[PDB]
Design brief:
Layout lengths: L10 H28 L5 H31 E4 L2 E4 L7 H21 L4 H26 L6 H29 L7 H23 L1 H4 L3 H36 L3 H9 L1
Helix pairs in contact: 1-2, 1-8, 2-3, 2-8, 3-4, 3-8, 4-5, 5-6, 6-8, 8-9
Bound molecules: retinal, hexadecane, tetradecane (C14), nonane (2 copies) and hexane (HEX) (2 copies).
GO cellular component, one term: membrane
Keywords: Chromophore, Membrane, Photoreceptor protein, Receptor, Retinal protein, Sensory transduction, Transmembrane, Transmembrane helix
Family: Belongs to the archaeal/bacterial/fungal opsin family.
């Protein structure tokens, strides 16, 4: 079970969560349109980094819309508060989105990093492997967020071990391949790494909400952190990857990338 199913919610708490999720759908699909449009101004060897953002926007947007539908269908406003009608709302569908979107977010980083060939394939394999372990162990720990907080923290500790290893591999490859990047994007890519580390750390914090704020307000706070983390890790992060791909495109002489930057 999950802590969401434990509480009734005031109209203010319930509708705030609903608007957070609905706004998340709108923001992800709004970025989707932008990424599709701007991808033509990216050189062919970087265009797959922009395509990966489109895939992330589609899958993140569809699953956020599924959760807003489940949120509305699970509770009804009875006797002055929103009460659970159906055992249907699960944050586990976020975990399947994460397993879908995390590899795409990692791959588009490696591409603008100018990883190629054997090093690109092998690095992607280990990063996806480390992400798989982080998601599966975290998903099992999330099963005990109501019944046994101790198991939530023990599985979260193992999941964090995968998280630290994944970031070490990413930081290692950035430090090693920064110099190959054009147009000053070698400076930009490590700030993207800092944003990635800040944004991805918001997820384990929301994961631990049942352990330090197990009430209706903690449920609101958790969806708030997820909303901030999604927009940061997918939309803002994707905009920076796209800027890097366009900047390196223009630096290599790709003409339509140069007009796009001339407008700003
Ligand atoms: C768009 C969604 C993204 C980038 C999700 C990222 C998720 C994580 C970095 C998850 C991290 C976790 C741990 C490090 C420990 C506790 C369990 C997890 C799975 C929440
Ligand atoms: C040419 C670069 C392609 C990069 C794609 C790498 C895919 C490697 C797949 C590794 C298998 C990991 C299985 C974990 C998923 C459950
Ligand atoms: C690129 C170098 C980044 C180094 C960051 C080190 C942060 C260490 C984390 C300590 C725990 C913080 C938990 C919020
Ligand atoms: C937990 C953050 C790991 C950062 C790795 C940096 C490695 C650079 C050589
Ligand atoms: C309640 C509005 C949430 C918007 C979060 C945006 C985060 C950007 C860093
Ligand atoms: C840059 C080579 C294409 C990447 C395929 C995932
Ligand atoms: C070069 C791929 C990194 C290996 C991680 C174990």
């Amino acid at each position: 079970k999950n802590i969401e199913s434990l509480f009734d919610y005031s109209a203010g708490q319930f509708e705030f969560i609903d608007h957070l999720l609905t706004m998340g759908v709108g923001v992800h699909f709004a970025a989707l349109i932008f990424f599709l449009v701007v991808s033509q101004f990216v050189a062919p060897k970087y265009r797959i980094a922009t395509a990966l953002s489109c895939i992330v926007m589609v899958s993140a947007g569809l699953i956020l819309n599924s959760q807003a539908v489940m949120w509305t269908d699970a509770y009804a406003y009875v006797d002055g508060s929103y009460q659970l009608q159906d055992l249907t709302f699960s944050n586990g569908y976020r975990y399947v989105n994460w397993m879908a979107t995390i590899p795409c977010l990692l791959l588009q980083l490696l591409i603008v990093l100018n990883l190629k060939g054997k090093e690109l394939f092998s690095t992607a394999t280990w990063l996806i492997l480390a992400a798989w372990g982080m998601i599966i162990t975290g998903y099992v720990g999330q099963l005990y967020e109501v019944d046994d907080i101790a198991q939530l923290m023990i599985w979260g500790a193992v999941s964090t071990a995968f998280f630290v290893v994944m970031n070490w591999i990413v930081g290692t490859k950035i430090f090693k391949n920064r110099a190959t990047m054009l147009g000053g994007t070698d400076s930009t890519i490590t700030k993207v790494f800092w944003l990635m580390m800040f944004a991805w750390t918001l997820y384990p914090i929301a994961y631990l909400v049942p352990a330090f704020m197990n009430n209706a307000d903690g449920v609101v706070l958790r969806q708030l952190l997820f909303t901030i983390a999604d927009i940061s890790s997918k939309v803002i992060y994707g905009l920076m990857i796209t800027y890097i791909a366009i900047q390196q495109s223009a630096a290599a002489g790709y003409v339509p990338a140069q007009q796009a930057l001339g407008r700003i």
